[PDB]
Amino acid sequence: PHCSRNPVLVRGIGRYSRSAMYSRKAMYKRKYLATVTKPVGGDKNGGTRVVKLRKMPRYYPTEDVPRKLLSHGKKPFSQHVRKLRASI
RNA sequence: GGGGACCGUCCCCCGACCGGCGACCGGCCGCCGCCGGGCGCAUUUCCACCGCGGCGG
Numbered sequence: 001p002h003c004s005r006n007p008v009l010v011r012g013i014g015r016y017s018r019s020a021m022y023s024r025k026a027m028y029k030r031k032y033l034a035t036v037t038k039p040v041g042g043d044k045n046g047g048t049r050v051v052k053l054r055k056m057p058r059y060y061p062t063e064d065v066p067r068k069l070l071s072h073g074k075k076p077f078s079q080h081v082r083k084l085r086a087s088i
Numbered sequence: 089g090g091g092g093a094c095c096g097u098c099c100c101c102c103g104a105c106c107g108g109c110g111a112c113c114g115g116c117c118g119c120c121g122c123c124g125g126g127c128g129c130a131u132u133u134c135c136a137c138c139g140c141g142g143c144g145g
Contacts, residue, residue, distance in 0.1 A: 038131050049132040065145070 005024060006014040016024060034054070039047035 040128095040130060040132055042128085042130055042132090045128060045130080045132085047131095049130090051132075061145095067145090 006016055006021065009015050014021075022028070035050050035052040037048065037050045040049045041047075
């Protein structure tokens with residue numbers, strides 16, 4: 001891997017233009033199991049007990065709530081940017 | 089005034105023709121599903137409890 005190769009001068013704005021990065025990056029040459037089987041341990045059984053993970057639920061609630069739409073943001077607190085007052 | 093014939097219509101048999109088994113029914117083979125009873129009794133399946141457990145609501 002390499003660095004960003006695009007120094008940022010304003011948040012969301014790169015220094016170099018779209019065509020400038022084409023030359024800098026040199027693109028002109030760089031172009032292009034649910035189920036497991038295990039034996040049972042008894043004769044006249046077959047030893048072919050196929051078991052699946054994530055089995056079907058044994059109970060379903062009478063009503064369910066629909067899922068919410070997507071937000072493309074609202075990061076959890078653990079990854080928020082920590083801002084410190086300049087006088088500190 | 090009778091009774092017949094004819095015409096139009098239904099009601100019937102009796103055939104033969106096409107279309108369809110339709111939401112009008114059965115019998116047979118096929119496929120699928122379920123139930124009951126056998127066999128299958130154990131790394132399968134199920135039940136219940138515990139963990140200051142992990143995930144989604």
